Amino acid sequence: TLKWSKMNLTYRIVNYTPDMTHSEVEKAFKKAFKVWSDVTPLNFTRLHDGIADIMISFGIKEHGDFYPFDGPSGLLAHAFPPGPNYGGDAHFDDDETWTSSSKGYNLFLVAAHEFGHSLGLDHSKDPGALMFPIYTYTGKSHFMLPDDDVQGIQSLYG
Ligand SMILES: COc1ccc(S(=O)(=O)N(Cc2cccnc2)c2c(C)cccc2C(=O)NO)cc1
Numbered sequence: 001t002l003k004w005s006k007m008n009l010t011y012r013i014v015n016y017t018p019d020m021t022h023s024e025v026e027k028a029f030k031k032a033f034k035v036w037s038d039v040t041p042l043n044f045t046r047l048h049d050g051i052a053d054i055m056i057s058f059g060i061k062e063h064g065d066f067y068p069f070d071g072p073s074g075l076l077a078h079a080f081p082p083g084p085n086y087g088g089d090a091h092f093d094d095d096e097t098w099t100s101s102s103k104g105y106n107l108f109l110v111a112a113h114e115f116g117h118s119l120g121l122d123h124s125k126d127p128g129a130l131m132f133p134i135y136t137y138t139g140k141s142h143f144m145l146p147d148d149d150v151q152g153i154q155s156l157y158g
């Protein structure tokens with residue numbers, strides 16, 4: 001029922017994290033778009049400047065929300081439904097430990113999950129699906145959306 005009115009989308013990174021170098025964070029998001037763009041005709045373009053539909057940034061406990069973060073563990077990130085404005089945004093916890101290795105919460109795992117919500121997908125009951133409510137580490141060497149997620153995204157965007 002909920003979906004973007006166009007396959008063209010843009011995004012902008014407000015800032016990186018001192019936890020890892022900027023290059024490590026940049027390739028992390030690029031891999032996320034590739035995995036989702038592999039089974040979707042969506043086009044993602046990075047904007048050097050200006051406001052983008054999906055802006056990614058790292059926040060801290062209190063930052064202007066009715067229910068901010070609960071500390072290190074808990075909300076690893078959050079986003080609002082899609083919309084021609086603030087919606088479609090995505091915030092990450094800066095108080096947590098972001099690493100590209102298998103430690104704490106992998107940035108790629110949370111990143112792929114928030115995009116799923118922006119695509120109009122709801123939490124799935126499959127533990128192998130990225131939309132699973134519980135955080136789980138997976139081998140990004142060749143991970144691909146399972147049949148459950150592929151059937152759902154295809155049914156929405158076709
Ligand atoms: C692999 O991707 C993700 C993305 C978000 C989260 S999460 O902690 O924000 N998370 C799910 C959750 C986690 C562990 C125990 N209970 C619930 C949530 C929590 C804690 C509170 C409210 C919403 C979510 C949510 O689903 N956001 O997408 C966990 C894993």
Ligand SMILES: [Ca+2]
Nearest residue numbers: 072073074075
């Ligand atoms: Ca948290």
Ligand SMILES: [Zn+2]
Nearest residue numbers: 059063065091
């Ligand atoms: Zn926030």
Ligand SMILES: [Zn+2]
Nearest residue numbers: 113117123133
């Ligand atoms: Zn979720």
